Amino acid sequence: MTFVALYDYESRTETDLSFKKGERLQIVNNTEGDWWLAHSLTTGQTGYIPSNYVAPS
C-alpha cells in the first residue's frame, strides 16, 4: 500500500525513482510484477528481470 523511505536513494538509470528519507511512497501495480536480480545459466548474463515472466523449475 503506502510506504515510507528510511534512506535517501539516488537514481542510477532513467527508470528508477530518486527519493529522500521521509518521503511517502505508493506501490503501483504492473503486469510485470516485482523485479528480481537474476543470473542466466543459459547465457551467463546477469541483470534485473520481471518476476511475472518466469516460473519455478
Side-chain angles (χ1 to χ4, degrees):
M1 49 194 115
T2 298
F3 293 72
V4 55
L6 306 162
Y7 320 89
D8 295 352
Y9 175 76
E10 194 187 313
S11 42
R12 306 186 298 211
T13 78
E14 69 281 45
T15 51
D16 52 353
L17 175 66
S18 296
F19 55 82
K20 296 268 157 235
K21 179 175 174 259
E23 283 193 38
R24 281 170 72 81
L25 299 162
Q26 193 162 256
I27 301 308
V28 162
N29 277 336
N30 49 351
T31 50
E32 301 171 341
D34 297 355
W35 289 68
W36 296 340
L37 187 58
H39 178 60
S40 170
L41 304 179
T42 305
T43 65
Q45 301 177 18
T46 311
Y48 298 97
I49 63 169
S51 54
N52 289 344
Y53 273 59
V54 312
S57 37

Short mmCIF file of all heavy atoms in Angstrom, two decimals:
data_model
loop_
_atom_site.label_atom_id
_atom_site.label_comp_id
_atom_site.label_asym_id
_atom_site.label_seq_id
_atom_site.Cartn_x
_atom_site.Cartn_y
_atom_site.Cartn_z
N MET A 1 0.83 -1.20 0.00
CA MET A 1 0.00 0.00 0.00
C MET A 1 0.87 1.26 0.00
O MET A 1 1.54 1.55 -1.00
CB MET A 1 -0.96 -0.02 1.20
CG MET A 1 -0.30 -0.33 2.56
SD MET A 1 -1.50 -0.72 3.84
CE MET A 1 -1.05 -2.42 4.12
N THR A 2 0.84 2.01 1.10
CA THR A 2 1.68 3.18 1.31
C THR A 2 2.90 2.85 2.17
O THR A 2 2.78 2.17 3.19
CB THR A 2 0.88 4.28 2.03
OG1 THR A 2 -0.23 4.67 1.21
CG2 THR A 2 1.74 5.49 2.34
N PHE A 3 4.07 3.35 1.76
CA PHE A 3 5.33 3.12 2.46
C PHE A 3 6.06 4.41 2.73
O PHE A 3 5.74 5.45 2.15
CB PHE A 3 6.23 2.21 1.62
CG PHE A 3 5.70 0.82 1.48
CD1 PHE A 3 4.61 0.56 0.68
CD2 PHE A 3 6.29 -0.23 2.16
CE1 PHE A 3 4.11 -0.71 0.56
CE2 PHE A 3 5.79 -1.51 2.03
CZ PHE A 3 4.70 -1.75 1.23
N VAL A 4 7.06 4.34 3.60
CA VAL A 4 7.91 5.48 3.89
C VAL A 4 9.37 5.09 3.72
O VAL A 4 9.75 3.95 3.98
CB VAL A 4 7.64 6.04 5.31
CG1 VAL A 4 7.78 4.93 6.36
CG2 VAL A 4 8.55 7.22 5.62
N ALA A 5 10.18 6.05 3.30
CA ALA A 5 11.57 5.79 2.95
C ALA A 5 12.51 6.00 4.14
O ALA A 5 12.46 7.02 4.82
CB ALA A 5 11.99 6.69 1.80
N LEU A 6 13.38 5.02 4.36
CA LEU A 6 14.29 5.03 5.50
C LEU A 6 15.59 5.70 5.12
O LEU A 6 16.29 6.24 5.97
CB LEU A 6 14.55 3.59 5.93
CG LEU A 6 13.28 2.78 6.22
CD1 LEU A 6 13.62 1.30 6.20
CD2 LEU A 6 12.67 3.19 7.55
N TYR A 7 15.92 5.66 3.83
CA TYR A 7 17.17 6.21 3.34
C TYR A 7 16.95 7.02 2.07
O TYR A 7 15.98 6.81 1.34
CB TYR A 7 18.16 5.08 3.04
CG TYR A 7 18.15 3.96 4.07
CD1 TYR A 7 17.28 2.88 3.93
CD2 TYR A 7 18.99 3.98 5.16
CE1 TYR A 7 17.26 1.86 4.87
CE2 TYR A 7 18.98 2.96 6.10
CZ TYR A 7 18.11 1.91 5.95
OH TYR A 7 18.11 0.89 6.89
N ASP A 8 17.86 7.95 1.81
CA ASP A 8 17.92 8.61 0.53
C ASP A 8 18.28 7.56 -0.52
O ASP A 8 19.01 6.62 -0.22
CB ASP A 8 18.98 9.69 0.53
CG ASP A 8 18.67 10.82 1.48
OD1 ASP A 8 17.55 10.87 2.03
OD2 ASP A 8 19.55 11.69 1.66
N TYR A 9 17.76 7.72 -1.73
CA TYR A 9 18.21 6.91 -2.86
C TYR A 9 18.35 7.79 -4.09
O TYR A 9 17.42 8.52 -4.44
CB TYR A 9 17.26 5.74 -3.14
CG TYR A 9 17.66 4.99 -4.38
CD1 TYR A 9 18.74 4.12 -4.37
CD2 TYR A 9 16.99 5.18 -5.59
CE1 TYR A 9 19.13 3.45 -5.51
CE2 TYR A 9 17.37 4.51 -6.74
CZ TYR A 9 18.44 3.65 -6.69
OH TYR A 9 18.82 2.99 -7.84
N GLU A 10 19.51 7.74 -4.73
CA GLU A 10 19.78 8.49 -5.94
C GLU A 10 19.65 7.58 -7.17
O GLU A 10 20.27 6.53 -7.23
CB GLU A 10 21.18 9.10 -5.88
CG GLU A 10 21.48 10.17 -6.91
CD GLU A 10 22.94 10.60 -6.90
OE1 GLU A 10 23.47 10.86 -5.80
OE2 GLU A 10 23.55 10.67 -7.98
N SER A 11 18.84 8.00 -8.14
CA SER A 11 18.61 7.21 -9.36
C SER A 11 19.90 6.91 -10.12
O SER A 11 20.83 7.71 -10.13
CB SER A 11 17.64 7.95 -10.28
OG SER A 11 17.94 9.33 -10.32
N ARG A 12 19.92 5.76 -10.78
CA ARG A 12 21.11 5.28 -11.47
C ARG A 12 20.81 5.02 -12.92
O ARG A 12 21.71 4.89 -13.73
CB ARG A 12 21.60 4.02 -10.80
CG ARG A 12 21.81 4.24 -9.33
CD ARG A 12 22.43 3.06 -8.65
NE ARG A 12 21.59 1.87 -8.74
CZ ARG A 12 21.54 0.92 -7.81
NH1 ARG A 12 22.31 1.01 -6.73
NH2 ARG A 12 20.74 -0.12 -7.96
N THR A 13 19.52 4.93 -13.23
CA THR A 13 19.09 4.83 -14.60
C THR A 13 17.92 5.77 -14.83
O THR A 13 17.60 6.61 -13.99
CB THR A 13 18.67 3.39 -14.95
OG1 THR A 13 17.36 3.14 -14.44
CG2 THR A 13 19.65 2.38 -14.39
N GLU A 14 17.28 5.62 -15.98
CA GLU A 14 16.21 6.51 -16.37
C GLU A 14 14.86 5.95 -15.90
O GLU A 14 13.82 6.57 -16.08
CB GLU A 14 16.24 6.73 -17.89
CG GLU A 14 15.85 5.51 -18.73
CD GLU A 14 16.99 4.49 -18.85
OE1 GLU A 14 17.63 4.20 -17.81
OE2 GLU A 14 17.23 4.00 -19.97
N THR A 15 14.89 4.77 -15.29
CA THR A 15 13.66 4.10 -14.88
C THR A 15 13.49 4.05 -13.36
O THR A 15 12.39 3.78 -12.87
CB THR A 15 13.57 2.67 -15.42
OG1 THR A 15 14.78 1.97 -15.12
CG2 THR A 15 13.35 2.67 -16.94
N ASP A 16 14.57 4.31 -12.63
CA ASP A 16 14.43 4.25 -11.19
C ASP A 16 13.95 5.60 -10.62
O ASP A 16 13.99 6.64 -11.27
CB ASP A 16 15.68 3.72 -10.49
CG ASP A 16 16.93 4.44 -10.89
OD1 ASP A 16 16.87 5.28 -11.80
OD2 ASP A 16 17.99 4.13 -10.30
N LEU A 17 13.41 5.52 -9.42
CA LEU A 17 12.87 6.70 -8.74
C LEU A 17 13.83 7.16 -7.64
O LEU A 17 14.13 6.39 -6.73
CB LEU A 17 11.51 6.36 -8.12
CG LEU A 17 10.87 7.46 -7.27
CD1 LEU A 17 10.48 8.70 -8.11
CD2 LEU A 17 9.67 6.90 -6.54
N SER A 18 14.31 8.40 -7.74
CA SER A 18 15.08 9.01 -6.66
C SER A 18 14.13 9.45 -5.54
O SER A 18 13.01 9.90 -5.80
CB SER A 18 15.85 10.23 -7.17
OG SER A 18 16.81 9.87 -8.13
N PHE A 19 14.58 9.33 -4.30
CA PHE A 19 13.77 9.81 -3.20
C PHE A 19 14.63 10.08 -1.99
O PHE A 19 15.77 9.64 -1.90
CB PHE A 19 12.66 8.81 -2.85
CG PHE A 19 13.17 7.41 -2.56
CD1 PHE A 19 13.67 7.08 -1.31
CD2 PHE A 19 13.12 6.43 -3.53
CE1 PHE A 19 14.13 5.80 -1.05
CE2 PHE A 19 13.57 5.15 -3.27
CZ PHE A 19 14.07 4.83 -2.03
N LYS A 20 14.05 10.79 -1.05
CA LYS A 20 14.75 11.19 0.15
C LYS A 20 14.14 10.51 1.34
O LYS A 20 13.00 10.15 1.35
CB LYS A 20 14.70 12.69 0.34
CG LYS A 20 15.38 13.52 -0.70
CD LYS A 20 16.79 13.83 -0.36
CE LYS A 20 17.66 14.17 -1.55
NZ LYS A 20 18.90 13.34 -1.69
N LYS A 21 14.96 10.34 2.36
CA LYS A 21 14.47 9.79 3.60
C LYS A 21 13.32 10.66 4.08
O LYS A 21 13.46 11.88 4.15
CB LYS A 21 15.59 9.80 4.62
CG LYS A 21 15.20 9.28 5.97
CD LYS A 21 16.42 9.23 6.85
CE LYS A 21 16.04 8.85 8.27
NZ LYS A 21 16.00 10.06 9.12
N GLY A 22 12.17 10.05 4.38
CA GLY A 22 11.00 10.78 4.82
C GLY A 22 9.85 10.69 3.83
O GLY A 22 8.68 10.77 4.22
N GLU A 23 10.17 10.52 2.55
CA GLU A 23 9.16 10.53 1.50
C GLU A 23 8.14 9.40 1.65
O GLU A 23 8.50 8.27 1.99
CB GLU A 23 9.81 10.46 0.11
CG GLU A 23 10.40 11.78 -0.35
CD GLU A 23 10.77 11.80 -1.82
OE1 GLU A 23 10.01 11.22 -2.64
OE2 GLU A 23 11.80 12.41 -2.16
N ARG A 24 6.88 9.70 1.37
CA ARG A 24 5.83 8.69 1.36
C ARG A 24 5.68 8.18 -0.06
O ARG A 24 5.67 8.96 -1.01
CB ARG A 24 4.50 9.26 1.88
CG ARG A 24 4.44 9.35 3.40
CD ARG A 24 3.24 10.13 3.94
NE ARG A 24 1.94 9.45 3.81
CZ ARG A 24 1.49 8.51 4.63
NH1 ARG A 24 2.22 8.08 5.65
NH2 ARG A 24 0.29 7.98 4.43
N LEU A 25 5.58 6.86 -0.20
CA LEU A 25 5.59 6.21 -1.49
C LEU A 25 4.46 5.22 -1.57
O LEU A 25 4.13 4.54 -0.61
CB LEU A 25 6.90 5.46 -1.71
CG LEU A 25 8.18 6.29 -1.70
CD1 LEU A 25 9.37 5.37 -1.48
CD2 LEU A 25 8.32 7.06 -3.01
N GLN A 26 3.89 5.13 -2.76
CA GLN A 26 2.75 4.27 -3.01
C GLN A 26 3.10 3.27 -4.09
O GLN A 26 3.57 3.64 -5.16
CB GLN A 26 1.60 5.15 -3.47
CG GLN A 26 0.27 4.50 -3.48
CD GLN A 26 -0.82 5.53 -3.51
OE1 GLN A 26 -1.48 5.80 -2.51
NE2 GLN A 26 -1.00 6.15 -4.67
N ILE A 27 2.87 1.99 -3.82
CA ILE A 27 3.22 0.96 -4.78
C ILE A 27 2.21 0.87 -5.90
O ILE A 27 1.00 0.80 -5.68
CB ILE A 27 3.42 -0.41 -4.10
CG1 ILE A 27 4.52 -0.30 -3.04
CG2 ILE A 27 3.79 -1.48 -5.14
CD1 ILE A 27 5.84 0.31 -3.56
N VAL A 28 2.74 0.89 -7.12
CA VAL A 28 1.94 0.86 -8.33
C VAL A 28 1.87 -0.56 -8.83
O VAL A 28 2.86 -1.29 -8.80
CB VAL A 28 2.59 1.75 -9.41
CG1 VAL A 28 2.05 1.40 -10.80
CG2 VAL A 28 2.38 3.21 -9.06
N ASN A 29 0.70 -0.94 -9.34
CA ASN A 29 0.51 -2.26 -9.91
C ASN A 29 0.90 -2.30 -11.39
O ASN A 29 0.49 -1.45 -12.17
CB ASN A 29 -0.95 -2.70 -9.75
CG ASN A 29 -1.23 -3.29 -8.38
OD1 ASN A 29 -0.33 -3.79 -7.71
ND2 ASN A 29 -2.49 -3.24 -7.97
N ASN A 30 1.68 -3.31 -11.74
CA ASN A 30 2.10 -3.53 -13.11
C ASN A 30 2.00 -5.00 -13.46
O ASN A 30 2.14 -5.87 -12.60
CB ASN A 30 3.54 -3.04 -13.31
CG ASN A 30 4.49 -3.57 -12.25
OD1 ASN A 30 4.06 -4.16 -11.26
ND2 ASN A 30 5.78 -3.35 -12.46
N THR A 31 1.74 -5.27 -14.73
CA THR A 31 1.65 -6.63 -15.23
C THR A 31 3.01 -7.32 -15.09
O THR A 31 3.09 -8.55 -15.00
CB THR A 31 1.24 -6.59 -16.70
OG1 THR A 31 2.09 -5.67 -17.40
CG2 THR A 31 -0.20 -6.13 -16.82
N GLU A 32 4.06 -6.52 -15.03
CA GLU A 32 5.43 -7.02 -14.98
C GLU A 32 5.71 -7.80 -13.71
O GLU A 32 6.41 -8.81 -13.72
CB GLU A 32 6.40 -5.85 -15.04
CG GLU A 32 6.28 -4.98 -16.26
CD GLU A 32 7.10 -3.72 -16.15
OE1 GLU A 32 7.46 -3.34 -15.01
OE2 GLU A 32 7.38 -3.12 -17.21
N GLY A 33 5.16 -7.30 -12.60
CA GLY A 33 5.43 -7.87 -11.29
C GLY A 33 6.68 -7.26 -10.67
O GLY A 33 7.30 -6.38 -11.27
N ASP A 34 7.05 -7.71 -9.48
CA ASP A 34 8.28 -7.25 -8.82
C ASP A 34 9.47 -7.63 -9.68
O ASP A 34 9.41 -8.63 -10.39
CB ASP A 34 8.44 -7.92 -7.47
CG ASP A 34 7.34 -7.57 -6.49
OD1 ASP A 34 6.48 -6.73 -6.83
OD2 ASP A 34 7.33 -8.14 -5.38
N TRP A 35 10.54 -6.85 -9.61
CA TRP A 35 11.74 -7.15 -10.37
C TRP A 35 12.80 -7.76 -9.48
O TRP A 35 13.02 -7.31 -8.35
CB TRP A 35 12.27 -5.91 -11.06
CG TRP A 35 11.40 -5.46 -12.20
CD1 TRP A 35 10.14 -4.96 -12.12
CD2 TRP A 35 11.74 -5.49 -13.59
NE1 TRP A 35 9.66 -4.67 -13.37
CE2 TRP A 35 10.62 -4.99 -14.29
CE3 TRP A 35 12.86 -5.89 -14.30
CZ2 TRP A 35 10.62 -4.87 -15.67
CZ3 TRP A 35 12.85 -5.78 -15.67
CH2 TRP A 35 11.73 -5.27 -16.35
N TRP A 36 13.46 -8.78 -10.02
CA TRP A 36 14.48 -9.55 -9.31
C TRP A 36 15.79 -9.45 -10.05
O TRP A 36 15.80 -9.41 -11.28
CB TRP A 36 14.09 -11.02 -9.28
CG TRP A 36 12.85 -11.32 -8.53
CD1 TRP A 36 12.24 -10.55 -7.59
CD2 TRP A 36 12.04 -12.50 -8.67
NE1 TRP A 36 11.10 -11.18 -7.13
CE2 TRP A 36 10.97 -12.37 -7.77
CE3 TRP A 36 12.14 -13.65 -9.46
CZ2 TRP A 36 9.99 -13.36 -7.65
CZ3 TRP A 36 11.17 -14.62 -9.33
CH2 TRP A 36 10.11 -14.46 -8.43
N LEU A 37 16.88 -9.47 -9.31
CA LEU A 37 18.19 -9.60 -9.93
C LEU A 37 18.43 -11.08 -10.21
O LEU A 37 18.29 -11.92 -9.31
CB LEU A 37 19.27 -9.04 -9.01
CG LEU A 37 20.68 -8.97 -9.61
CD1 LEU A 37 20.71 -8.13 -10.88
CD2 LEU A 37 21.61 -8.41 -8.55
N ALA A 38 18.78 -11.42 -11.45
CA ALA A 38 18.87 -12.81 -11.87
C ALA A 38 20.07 -13.08 -12.76
O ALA A 38 20.55 -12.21 -13.47
CB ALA A 38 17.60 -13.22 -12.59
N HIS A 39 20.53 -14.33 -12.73
CA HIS A 39 21.68 -14.77 -13.50
C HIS A 39 21.21 -15.87 -14.43
O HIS A 39 20.61 -16.85 -13.98
CB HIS A 39 22.77 -15.29 -12.55
CG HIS A 39 23.98 -15.80 -13.26
ND1 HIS A 39 24.74 -15.02 -14.09
CD2 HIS A 39 24.55 -17.03 -13.27
CE1 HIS A 39 25.74 -15.74 -14.58
NE2 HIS A 39 25.65 -16.96 -14.10
N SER A 40 21.48 -15.73 -15.72
CA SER A 40 21.09 -16.75 -16.68
C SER A 40 22.13 -17.85 -16.78
O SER A 40 23.26 -17.61 -17.22
CB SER A 40 20.84 -16.17 -18.06
OG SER A 40 20.68 -17.22 -18.99
N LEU A 41 21.73 -19.05 -16.41
CA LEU A 41 22.57 -20.23 -16.56
C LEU A 41 22.75 -20.57 -18.03
O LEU A 41 23.65 -21.31 -18.42
CB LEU A 41 21.92 -21.40 -15.82
CG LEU A 41 21.66 -21.09 -14.35
CD1 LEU A 41 20.99 -22.26 -13.65
CD2 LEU A 41 22.96 -20.69 -13.64
N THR A 42 21.89 -19.99 -18.86
CA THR A 42 21.90 -20.29 -20.28
C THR A 42 22.90 -19.40 -21.03
O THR A 42 23.59 -19.89 -21.93
CB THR A 42 20.48 -20.15 -20.87
OG1 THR A 42 19.58 -20.98 -20.12
CG2 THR A 42 20.44 -20.55 -22.33
N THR A 43 22.99 -18.13 -20.66
CA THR A 43 23.83 -17.17 -21.39
C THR A 43 24.98 -16.63 -20.55
O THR A 43 25.93 -16.09 -21.08
CB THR A 43 23.01 -15.95 -21.88
OG1 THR A 43 22.54 -15.20 -20.76
CG2 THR A 43 21.83 -16.38 -22.73
N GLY A 44 24.86 -16.76 -19.23
CA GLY A 44 25.86 -16.21 -18.33
C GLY A 44 25.66 -14.74 -18.02
O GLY A 44 26.38 -14.17 -17.21
N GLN A 45 24.67 -14.12 -18.66
CA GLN A 45 24.39 -12.70 -18.44
C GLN A 45 23.65 -12.50 -17.11
O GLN A 45 23.08 -13.44 -16.56
CB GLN A 45 23.59 -12.14 -19.62
CG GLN A 45 24.34 -12.31 -20.93
CD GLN A 45 23.56 -11.84 -22.15
OE1 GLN A 45 22.59 -11.10 -22.04
NE2 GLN A 45 23.99 -12.29 -23.32
N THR A 46 23.64 -11.28 -16.59
CA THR A 46 23.08 -11.02 -15.28
C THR A 46 22.42 -9.64 -15.29
O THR A 46 22.92 -8.71 -15.92
CB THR A 46 24.17 -11.10 -14.19
OG1 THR A 46 24.93 -12.30 -14.35
CG2 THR A 46 23.56 -11.09 -12.81
N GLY A 47 21.29 -9.52 -14.61
CA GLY A 47 20.58 -8.26 -14.56
C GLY A 47 19.17 -8.47 -14.05
O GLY A 47 18.77 -9.59 -13.77
N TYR A 48 18.41 -7.39 -13.93
CA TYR A 48 17.08 -7.47 -13.36
C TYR A 48 16.06 -8.03 -14.35
O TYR A 48 16.12 -7.75 -15.55
CB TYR A 48 16.62 -6.10 -12.91
CG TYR A 48 17.51 -5.51 -11.83
CD1 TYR A 48 18.51 -4.61 -12.15
CD2 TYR A 48 17.34 -5.86 -10.50
CE1 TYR A 48 19.32 -4.07 -11.16
CE2 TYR A 48 18.15 -5.33 -9.51
CZ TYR A 48 19.14 -4.44 -9.85
OH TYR A 48 19.93 -3.91 -8.86
N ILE A 49 15.10 -8.80 -13.83
CA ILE A 49 14.06 -9.41 -14.65
C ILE A 49 12.68 -9.16 -14.03
O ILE A 49 12.56 -9.01 -12.82
CB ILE A 49 14.26 -10.94 -14.79
CG1 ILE A 49 14.15 -11.64 -13.43
CG2 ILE A 49 15.59 -11.24 -15.48
CD1 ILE A 49 14.07 -13.15 -13.52
N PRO A 50 11.64 -9.14 -14.87
CA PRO A 50 10.27 -9.02 -14.35
C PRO A 50 9.75 -10.38 -13.89
O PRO A 50 9.69 -11.31 -14.69
CB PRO A 50 9.50 -8.49 -15.55
CG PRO A 50 10.22 -9.06 -16.74
CD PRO A 50 11.67 -9.13 -16.35
N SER A 51 9.38 -10.49 -12.62
CA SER A 51 9.11 -11.78 -11.99
C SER A 51 7.94 -12.55 -12.62
O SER A 51 7.93 -13.78 -12.62
CB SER A 51 8.88 -11.60 -10.49
OG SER A 51 7.87 -10.65 -10.24
N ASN A 52 6.97 -11.84 -13.18
CA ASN A 52 5.81 -12.49 -13.79
C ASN A 52 6.13 -13.13 -15.14
O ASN A 52 5.26 -13.74 -15.77
CB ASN A 52 4.64 -11.51 -13.94
CG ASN A 52 4.01 -11.13 -12.61
OD1 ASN A 52 4.22 -11.80 -11.60
ND2 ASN A 52 3.21 -10.06 -12.61
N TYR A 53 7.38 -13.00 -15.59
CA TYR A 53 7.80 -13.57 -16.87
C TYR A 53 8.40 -14.95 -16.69
O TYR A 53 8.75 -15.61 -17.67
CB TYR A 53 8.83 -12.68 -17.55
CG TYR A 53 8.28 -11.57 -18.42
CD1 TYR A 53 7.44 -10.60 -17.90
CD2 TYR A 53 8.64 -11.47 -19.76
CE1 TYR A 53 6.96 -9.57 -18.70
CE2 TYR A 53 8.17 -10.45 -20.55
CZ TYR A 53 7.33 -9.50 -20.02
OH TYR A 53 6.87 -8.49 -20.83
N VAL A 54 8.54 -15.38 -15.44
CA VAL A 54 9.18 -16.65 -15.13
C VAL A 54 8.40 -17.45 -14.09
O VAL A 54 7.54 -16.91 -13.39
CB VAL A 54 10.63 -16.44 -14.61
CG1 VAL A 54 11.38 -15.46 -15.52
CG2 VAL A 54 10.64 -15.94 -13.16
N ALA A 55 8.71 -18.74 -14.00
CA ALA A 55 8.10 -19.62 -13.02
C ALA A 55 9.17 -20.55 -12.47
O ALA A 55 10.18 -20.79 -13.13
CB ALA A 55 6.99 -20.41 -13.66
N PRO A 56 8.95 -21.09 -11.26
CA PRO A 56 9.93 -22.06 -10.77
C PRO A 56 10.05 -23.28 -11.68
O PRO A 56 9.15 -23.56 -12.49
CB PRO A 56 9.36 -22.45 -9.39
CG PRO A 56 8.58 -21.25 -8.97
CD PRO A 56 7.96 -20.73 -10.23
N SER A 57 11.17 -23.96 -11.56
CA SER A 57 11.57 -25.03 -12.46
C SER A 57 10.64 -26.23 -12.34
O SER A 57 11.00 -27.35 -12.70
CB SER A 57 13.00 -25.42 -12.13
OG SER A 57 13.22 -25.38 -10.74
#
